[PDB]
Amino acid sequence: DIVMTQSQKFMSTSVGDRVSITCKASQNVGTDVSWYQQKPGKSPKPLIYWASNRFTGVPDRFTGSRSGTDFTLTISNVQSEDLADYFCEQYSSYPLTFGAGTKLELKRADAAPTVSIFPPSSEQLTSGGASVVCFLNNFYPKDINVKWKIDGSERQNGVLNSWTDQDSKDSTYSMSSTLTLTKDEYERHNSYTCEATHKTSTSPIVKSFNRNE
Amino acid sequence: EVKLQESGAELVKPGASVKLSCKASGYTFTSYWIDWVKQRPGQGLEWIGNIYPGNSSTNYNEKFKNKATLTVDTSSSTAYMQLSSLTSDDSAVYYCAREDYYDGTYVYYAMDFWGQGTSVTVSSAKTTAPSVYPLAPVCGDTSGSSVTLGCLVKGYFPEPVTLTWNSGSLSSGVHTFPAVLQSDLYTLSSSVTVTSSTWPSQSITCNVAHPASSTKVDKKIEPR
Amino acid sequence: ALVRWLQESRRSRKLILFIVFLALLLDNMLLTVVVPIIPSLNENVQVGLLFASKATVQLITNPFIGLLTNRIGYPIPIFAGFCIMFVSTIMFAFSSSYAFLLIARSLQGIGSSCSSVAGMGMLASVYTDDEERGNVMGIALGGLAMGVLVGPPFGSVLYEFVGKTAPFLVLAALVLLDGAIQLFVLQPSRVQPESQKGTPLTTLLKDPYILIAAGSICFANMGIAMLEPALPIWMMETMCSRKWQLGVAFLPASISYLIGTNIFGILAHKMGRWLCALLGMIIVGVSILCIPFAKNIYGLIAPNFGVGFAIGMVDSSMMPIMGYLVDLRHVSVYGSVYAIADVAFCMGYAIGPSAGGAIAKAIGFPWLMTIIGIIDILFAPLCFFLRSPPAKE
């Protein structure tokens, strides 16, 4: 089975720049390679067939190239409509294998996350459940880390993390982290801290609260 | 007007079978191959198989040989894929595509038309209604610049849930996060950022509606 | 099995390549079968007309097919070539008078022009990668070599074992099978005009870098076209060789051509195509110069191998470059840029049997060979200008 390797899962660009996405075959797939683009919320559509030929209705920006077992898709003038997923397919021999995705995302100046902490509500405590929420609101660099410390316990179980896609208006990311505890376990401990470590600042942003308040 | 219509979503209990449909219209059904492909969330596409609606000649991926069975119905112009003995691994999005020939010839060059996916989910949670709790800022800690509010939704099985702030009045600085499965039940939370003086003066309510299990809960955030 | 393998598979362009190869093979086999049978305004104009008819008609027909290919598409000309070849074979299989024996050859010429031009154009159009285009045209050009290698033996085995019309009644079935394969691959019932209009023929014919590529093929093939009929006459005149030695004397020039066409199609891209053509022209010139110094067939063994090898190199180098140049400096429409290549191919086979014989009568075989070799050697440096043609688009 030929393995079509796509090195980068995420690519960051800006409007007007030129970008190239590479897909490397494994067993000399000779120009039996196609490129497909999937827009957010839509189904994939072909762009390049036979590794160099442009599909009908595709703008002149997209070009396809091959050098041996390396296939390159080049977008000369990236626009706002070119931010989507791109993948490569080979049909040289069954089984048909697709390359992994590659997402194009906007670029902007770095921002530090806004960290907000939320203790469990009284209604949840009446039902015997406790949930501490930590919102990391607006930061450009996608990667970020969160540590939950219950008086330094460094708990890593029961943590649920949700990540938002890039904002349309601001081109910034967000994430939420929830620590779920039983009521009896919640009452035993006093202080809860959420630490957000980001690329911009070496020192993590700490947000802590005390149950006695 | 080539169209491949696929069902929006499917729910199947573990250790059971499902049959996904692809209705083809706008062209001669029996003259083009139909491809079935699978995409897991956060993973690459996997080619499930091929069928020719004319003679019903199939091509199977050896990985999916014992799982997927492709059949056709030319009278209704539909393509079915049956997946048997489903498990939690099989939760993915299944795509139905059509192969196109180069002009004047019969050689294949691209899969021009793809049907929309079918989100198959394997779970046994039995349609639980959501529980909604309001999150308020910690006691004291008056932030002069701005304040952040939120409402937490816990324990609802059917995926589609709608969360709106002040019945759609608030749409600036509002972040809603994707639902995450924890113990066969989903969890979803959202946050709204407002000015320091806006929240104490004007009440803010988190409006949430569950279509599958008819519920409409409104919660007003109050200071602790 | 073979039914299930073809029934359940994504059809590839290798089927198109196979179709082109089979068409060229059958056309050249039909060409070479009749030559041993033709001898059977008195044997002076008639025989020369019979020999030159197909090549002349193909040379005349090529530009019209080149324009029609852009007008309507490739598959319809390909199928028309198959049909005309089948009708020509059936007419050969039964006609006895001279007029019908000439009509059949003219029809074969028309069908061969259609098949060759349309097949080369489609191969260029579907294989737009330089390396892949070179490889596929090298593979397809071997069809002519194999056809001319297997023609005469195929004709001679059946001209005595079965009967007179057995070679044609057997070739007709092969043509029918080729037509069935074409029906399985193409759609010859729909007109598909090309999206963009190609450049006019006159504009292409004013290109200095295309005239050099065409002249290389023309002057390389003319040497073997003149040498093939003139060699046995000089062999009988000088070495009093028997009737059986004449057929085997030219075997190396065909075997080596078949080998070289296949290997250099892929070997002429690692090194420059310009260098491959230059070296091929020099080698064929030297070999043709050295041919008339052979006192027996053993002397004739090696120069014939050199001639065939070098002609294979120049053909495999100059076929893709026609099409590479039109991509580089013109509109990417290969219909009428391979009509020129086919005209260059057919000029030698239309002119050689008469002009070479006349020159051998006038001055002699050694002087004719020296002239051909000197021309091939002097044309070689002109292929240096294809090292880097300006894009100029």
Structure tokens at B161: 């849930």
Establish, for the pair of chains A and C, how many residue pairs have beta carbons separated by less than 8 Å: 13
Same fold, B3-122 and B131-220: yes
Rounded Cα distance, C226 and C230, in Å: 6
**Which one-letter amino acid corresponds to residue C89?**
T
Q: Which residues are bridge partners to A98 per DSSP?
A: A89
Q: With an 8 Å Cβ cutoff, is C126 touching chain B?
A: yes
Distance from CA of C72 to the nearest CA of B (A): 10
Residue C140 near residue C264, CB atoms below 8 Å? no
Rounded Cα distance, C308 and C366, in Å: 19
Structure tokens at A29: 């797939």
CATH architecture of the domain formed by C1-194? Up-down Bundle (1.20)
Structure tokens at A57: 């209705």
- For chain A, domains (ranges, CATH) are 10-105 (2.60.40.10), 115-210 (2.60.40.10)
Q: Nearest residue on chain C to B57, judged by CA atoms?
A: C8
Instruction: Mutation target for B interface from C7, C8, C128, C136: give the one with most B CBs within 10 A.
Output: C8
- From the list C7, C13, C185, the residue facing B57 with the nearest CB is C7
Kind plus residue range of the DSSP H or E element containing C354: helix C337-362
Rounded Cα distance, C154 and C37, in Å: 12
Chain A residues whose beta carbon lies within 8 Å of the beta carbon of residue B136:
118, 121
Describe the crossing of helices C14-34 and C98-126 by its angle, rounded to 10 degrees. 160
**Which one-letter amino acid corresponds to residue C62?**
N
**Between chains, do C129 and A32 touch, taking CB under 8 Å as contact?**
no
Resolution of this structure in Å:
3.0
Residue C145 near residue C251, CB atoms below 8 Å? no
- From the list A87, A137, A162, the residue facing B45 with the nearest CB is A87
Name the residue ranges covered by the structural domains of chain B.
3-122, 131-220
Measured from the Cβ of residue A30, the count of other Cβ atoms closer than 10 Å reads 17
User: Does C194 show up as a binding residue in the annotation?
Assistant: no
**Between chains, do A31 and C129 touch, taking CB under 8 Å as contact?**
yes
Cis before residue A95, ω within 30 degrees of 0? Answer: yes
Q: Which residues are bridge partners to B19 per DSSP?
A: B82
Of the candidates C347, C216, C375, C218, the residue with the CA atom closest to the CA atom of residue C280: C216
Chain B residues whose beta carbon lies within 8 Å of the beta carbon of residue A41:
none
Q: Nearest residue on chain A to C9, judged by CA atoms?
A: A94
- Solved with: cryo-EM
Structure tokens at C86: 């089948």
Q: Nearest residue on chain C to A32, judged by CA atoms?
A: C12
Residue A131 near residue A118, CB atoms below 8 Å? no
Q: Which residues are bridge partners to B138 per DSSP?
A: none
Rounded Cα distance, B176 and B171, in Å: 11
Is the C-alpha dihedral spanning C287, C288, C293, C294 positive or negative? positive
Per-residue DSSP letter, C279: H
Q: Nearest residue on chain B to A51, judged by CA atoms?
A: B109
Rounded Cα distance, A125 and B175, in Å: 25
**Between chains, do C75 and B106 touch, taking CB under 8 Å as contact?**
no
Rounded Cα distance, A197 and A187, in Å: 27
Of the candidates C181, C238, C128, the residue with the CA atom closest to the CA atom of residue C22: C181
Q: Which residues are bridge partners to B208 per DSSP?
A: B163, B217
Residues of chain C within CATH 1.20.1250.20 domain(s) are 1-194, 196-393
Torsion of CA A180, A185, A186, A187, to 10 degrees: 170
Measured from the Cβ of residue A210, the count of other Cβ atoms closer than 10 Å reads 12
Rounded Cα distance, A93 and C298, in Å: 49
Structure tokens at C329: 């400096």
**Which one-letter amino acid corresponds to residue C83?**
C
Per-residue DSSP letter, B177: P
Of the candidates B43, B35, B84, B77, the residue with the CA atom closest to the CA atom of residue B60: B35
Task: Tell the burial category of A171 from Cβ atoms under 10 Å away from its Cβ (0-12, 13-18, 19+).
Answer: middle
Distance from CA of A74 to the nearest CA of C (A): 17
**Between chains, do B191 and A43 touch, taking CB under 8 Å as contact?**
no
**Between chains, do C128 and A91 touch, taking CB under 8 Å as contact?**
no
User: Does C132 show up as a binding residue in the annotation?
Assistant: no
Chain B residues whose beta carbon lies within 8 Å of the beta carbon of residue C13:
107
Structure tokens at C97: 């008078």
Residue A45 near residue A52, CB atoms below 8 Å? no
CATH number belonging to domain B131-220: 2.60.40.10
Distance from CA of B66 to the nearest CA of C (A): 19
Q: Which CATH superfamily is domain C196-393 in?
A: MFS general substrate transporter like domains (1.20.1250.20)
Residue C249 near residue C297, CB atoms below 8 Å? yes
User: Does C47 show up as a binding residue in the annotation?
Assistant: no
User: Does C258 show up as a binding residue in the annotation?
Assistant: no
Distance from CA of B68 to the nearest CA of C (A): 18
Contacts by residues C353-358 (CB-CB < 8 Å, ≥ 24 positions apart): C353/C48, C353/C51, C353/C52, C353/C225, C353/C226, C353/C229, C354/C48, C354/C51, C354/C52, C355/C226, C356/C225, C356/C226, C356/C227, C356/C229, C356/C230, C357/C229, C357/C230
Measured from the Cβ of residue A95, the count of other Cβ atoms closer than 10 Å reads 17
Q: Which CATH superfamily is domain B3-122 in?
A: Immunoglobulins (2.60.40.10)
**Three-class secondary structure of residue A91 per DSSP:** coil
**Between chains, do A45 and B114 touch, taking CB under 8 Å as contact?**
yes
What is the bridge-based pairing of β-strands B9-12 and B118-122?
Answer: parallel
Q: With an 8 Å Cβ cutoff, is C186 touching chain B?
A: yes
Chain A residues whose beta carbon lies within 8 Å of the beta carbon of residue C127:
31
**Between chains, do C128 and A66 touch, taking CB under 8 Å as contact?**
no
Rounded Cα distance, C346 and C350, in Å: 6
**Which one-letter amino acid corresponds to residue A141?**
P
Phi first, then psi: what are they for B108, rounded to 5°?
-85, 140
Rounded Cα distance, C220 and C253, in Å: 13
**Between chains, do A164 and B111 touch, taking CB under 8 Å as contact?**
no
What Cα–Cα distance (Å) separates residue C363 from each residue in C237, C292, C356? Answer: 15, 14, 11
Rounded Cα distance, B39 and C387, in Å: 48
